[PDB]
Design a binder for these strands. Structure first.
Lengths: 105, 154, 58
RNA sequence: GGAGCGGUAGUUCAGUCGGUUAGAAUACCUGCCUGUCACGCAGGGGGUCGCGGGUUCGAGUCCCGUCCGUUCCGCCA
RNA sequence: GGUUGCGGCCAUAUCUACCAGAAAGCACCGUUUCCCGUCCGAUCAACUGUAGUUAAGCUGGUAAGAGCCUGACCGAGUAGUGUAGUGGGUGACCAUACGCGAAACUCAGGUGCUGCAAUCU
RNA sequence: GAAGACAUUGUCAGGUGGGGAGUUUGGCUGGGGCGGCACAUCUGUUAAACGAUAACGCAGAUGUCCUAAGGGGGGCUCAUGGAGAACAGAAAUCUCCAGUAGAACAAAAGGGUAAAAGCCCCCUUGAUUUUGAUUUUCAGUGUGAAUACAAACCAUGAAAGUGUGGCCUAUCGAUCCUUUAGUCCCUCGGAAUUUGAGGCUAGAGGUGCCAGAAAAGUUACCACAGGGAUAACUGGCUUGUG
RNA sequence: UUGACAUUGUGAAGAGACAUAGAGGGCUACCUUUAUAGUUUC
RNA sequence: GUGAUUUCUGCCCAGUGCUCUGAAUGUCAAAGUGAAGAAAUUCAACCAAGCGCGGGUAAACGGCGGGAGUAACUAUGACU
RNA sequence: AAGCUCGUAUCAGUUUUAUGAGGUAAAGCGAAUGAUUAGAGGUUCCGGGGUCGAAAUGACCUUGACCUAUUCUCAAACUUUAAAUAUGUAAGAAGUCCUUGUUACUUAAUUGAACGUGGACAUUUGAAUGAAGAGCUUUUAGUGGGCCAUUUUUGGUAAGC
RNA sequence: CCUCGCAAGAGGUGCACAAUCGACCGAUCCUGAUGUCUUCGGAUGGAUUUGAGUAAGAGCAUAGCUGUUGGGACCCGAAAG
């Protein structure tokens, strides 16, 4: 698929609440870090014998992930996410398709 | 006004698993967390009330070593994804090769082949004549696979 | 091992033991579902119009 | 009976699972070298890629049917 | 009754071939500067109805017409089915009582109706 | 005598470790086994003219593609046949005639559609935000999809209208945990300040045994509960196969 | 089985990694170095 | 492990193991060292053996294929 | 089972009148989609063939196509046409009529619409027949292994499948 | 129930309860006016939203039938640990 780098959509910043220009970043997982309740609460259960308790994951089937667009306004720069349907090949690149000029080779 | 553009990448994708009874000769399988192509395929009963296993033997695409596995056939062996880039080969510079996509000519990379077949290519380059050399990107591993050359194009 | 899967036999008779309950229509049907614009206006009518039917009587 | 796969000049094989050029070998052909034939030299020609159909703008490079040719199961009694 | 503008039912109004048509009224026809738009003013825009036709579209008529619409106790109450029977039939199925009721073939017939506004020898 | 502050011994950390321990080892399934998936979903039929309706009944498909093949507006309108123009010759282009459509609409199948829901052109991103109602499957709970609106804000268009994904029917999945944004709002409970952590709203990270347990085998040495709902010997209808 | 710490106490004699400074290279990713003031495992 | 004596113990280290006074800067923890940071902590940096990589070993487990064409009867087919 | 609110309510596994939607049996392919027979007539220069003519967009035979008009027999995934059976609604007083008021919705305009005012129609107030009552709620067992017949029908050669 | 009506019926008063429509409290979303250790405070009204809400209140306790959950739990029954 393909998506525009720039998009004019609705922006609620309490200072505008009107359509503005948006630069489109792509969403990013991020480091799981530490200290999160799900970490302390976990490793406290991992220590000592008995080993693995919190169930491991195996059966993965789905090959795709909904691509999340991280939007930025150019005035108040709020960040409001947006979702797209599942796609295997993503790009934010430009060079919009032509009229159907002859397929090369 | 704002900058640095934070250019990143593309999202999604994967290597789709399948039922392990559909695999075939020159099918593509991940054993050892490594890609492979099947050569020897075998199925069997266990004993009386058999839940049938399958013992594949697969020779690597990239490394080349001969690998084996045995599993019951329902549970999945996750399959890598394969594509040819059909690159055209210009001069081979240093240890890398230099490949030209029709659309763009960037990306010399691809290490040049370890392949003994890449030696005939190494040999036949100075003779020339449109070097059209496919490679495969499967699981981000890319190395030269086959040499090919057109006969005309002028 | 196969079990009889799906059949309607002796159903349409069961429902007729209690005799097919009716919807029970009312006076003043609930206006749930009506457009808000016609419903917002309608609020100010009954609200006010009772007054000339209340305040005027004395 | 089931299911699985093969079907490319001469012959053995790739491409053949990923469609818009069918590649090698040896075979057979030519001219030389030899007194001829070996051999070595310089070149050379040859296959809708087993058929019917259908998709596909395009199909050996897809799908179904034939055709033939492989296999594996065939057990608890 | 004719014509035009907007229509409503939407082949009793369409197709095909011929033959007509006063009056106005449409319609075909004339020029490219400005506005406009195409490879091209043929389409489209612009400009007078002038220069001219009614050939064409348009309306009407004609065609043992093709069609379509309707009807005909014509096909047929025949196919089909609801109900019911210790009715028949070796069965397949078929009669009967109570009731409903087709299509095709057939013949006969029709072939646009109509609302508002204006205008018309 | 050696041996020498190294070994050993003690605590931690990585490796190794079926020697040892615990534990599992789908479901459907005209016995079970292999096989297939009919265990989510879609199109047509089997349905016996509302709806409902089954089977390892049949014919097939998906787990993707598209910033565009979306949205609006404008123009034109197809496949095909016929006739004809140097190189051209079934397949090179052009011009006219006939042409309700016999074509094209991402991907099966059936609908639907022509001054368009097709071909081309101009601009665009309503594939946005709040947040409910309703149909669908139905427990009339969910997920998914769809309609209808309000409140906006906008695109388009001369306008009226149209537009909250893909002309329509399938293209997707819960709590815990992690993670981003929004509120920068609320807590840290003696009282304060800042980093940190927890919270609300809305997403995403997967559960395709598709309403969602982290799990391989053999037992003619087997064990116990039971089963004729589940086979082999026997009998019965059944007659292809004899 | 391997690694750190501890019991563990006195000594030692050379090597290098990392620090700056100058040359030898292709502003340097380094490089052969090298003189200097340190940290170090050995 | 084989199983008296006689005779012989063939070919294959890719696989699976076992091994190497085997290279070593790919993998690579605790501890330890520097920087950030008001601080926990974050970051790396270097980083044990094994894994990895290369070496051998089959009286170690184990394994030992097809299909063509051809002899002045046919058939076969040493041979290509 | 416990009851409760009410007692002719509103209903009623039902008919009639009117008006709906349905595509199956049937029927049809001289109507399309699909098959499918056999002849007759034309056509090709843009189909090979044959005789005659250097020759051919050549005279006429040739089969393949077609195209024309007929005929044969059909269709679970074909269809103009279209049944009985079963199904949806209406049959009013929470009605109709007259007149008039309310509004931040709506309009050329209190024009509408939604409701309400006041009066008229009352028991033939407005289809047939009936109603050991009509409605409502709590709560909890037991069941979730079915079978057979007449009709309709799928797989099967057929089955007390 | 009351008034009138011989009665039949008509009018008013109508608790309980049903059906809606409002009103007020909370949450979420807008407004945020006045004043403001100037930045805090919130008045005022709105919102296809929302609650196990108020709307002159009804529960507590004991016993009892029935029903659930936990317990040796209707009785008996394992092969195992």
């Amino acid at each position: 698929v393909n998506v525009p780098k720039t998009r004019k959509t609705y922006c609620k910043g309490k200072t505008c609440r009107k359509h503005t220009q948006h630069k489109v970043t792509q969403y990013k997982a991020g480091k799981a870090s530490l200290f999160a309740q799900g970490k302390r609460r976990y490793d406290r259960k991992q220590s000592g014998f008995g080993g693995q308790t919190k169930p491991v994951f195996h059966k993965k089937a789905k090959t795709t992930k909904k691509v999340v667009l991280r939007l930025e306004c150019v005035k108040c720069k709020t960040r409001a996410q947006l979702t797209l349907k599942r796609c295997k090949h993503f790009e934010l690149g430009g060079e919009k398709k032509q009229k159907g000029q002859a397929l090369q080779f | 006004e704002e900058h640095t553009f934070e250019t990143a990448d593309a999202g999604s994708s994967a290597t789709y698993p399948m039922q392990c009874s559909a695999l075939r000769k020159n099918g593509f399988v991940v054993i050892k967390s490594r890609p492979c192509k099947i050569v020897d395929m075998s199925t069997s009963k266990t004993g009386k009330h058999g839940h049938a296993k399958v013992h594949l033997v697969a020779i690597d695409i990239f490394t080349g070593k001969k690998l084996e596995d045995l599993s019951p056939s329902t549970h999945n062996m996750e399959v890598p994804v394969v594509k040819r880039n059909e690159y055209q080969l210009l001069d081979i510079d240093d240890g890398f090769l230099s490949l030209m996509n029709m659309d763009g000519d960037t990306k010399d990379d691809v290490k040049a082949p370890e392949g003994e077949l890449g030696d005939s290519l190494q040999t036949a380059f100075d003779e020339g004549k449109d070097l059209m050399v496919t490679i495969i990107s499967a699981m981000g591993e890319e190395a030269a696979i086959s040499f090919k050359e057109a006969a005309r194009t002028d | 091992a196969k079990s009889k899967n799906h059949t309607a036999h002796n159903q349409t008779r069961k429902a007729h033991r209690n005799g097919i309950k009716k919807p029970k229509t009312y006076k003043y049907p609930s206006l749930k579902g009506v457009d808000p614009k016609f419903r917002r206006n309608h609020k100010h009518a009954l609200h006010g119009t009772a007054k000339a039917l209340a305040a005027a009587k004395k």
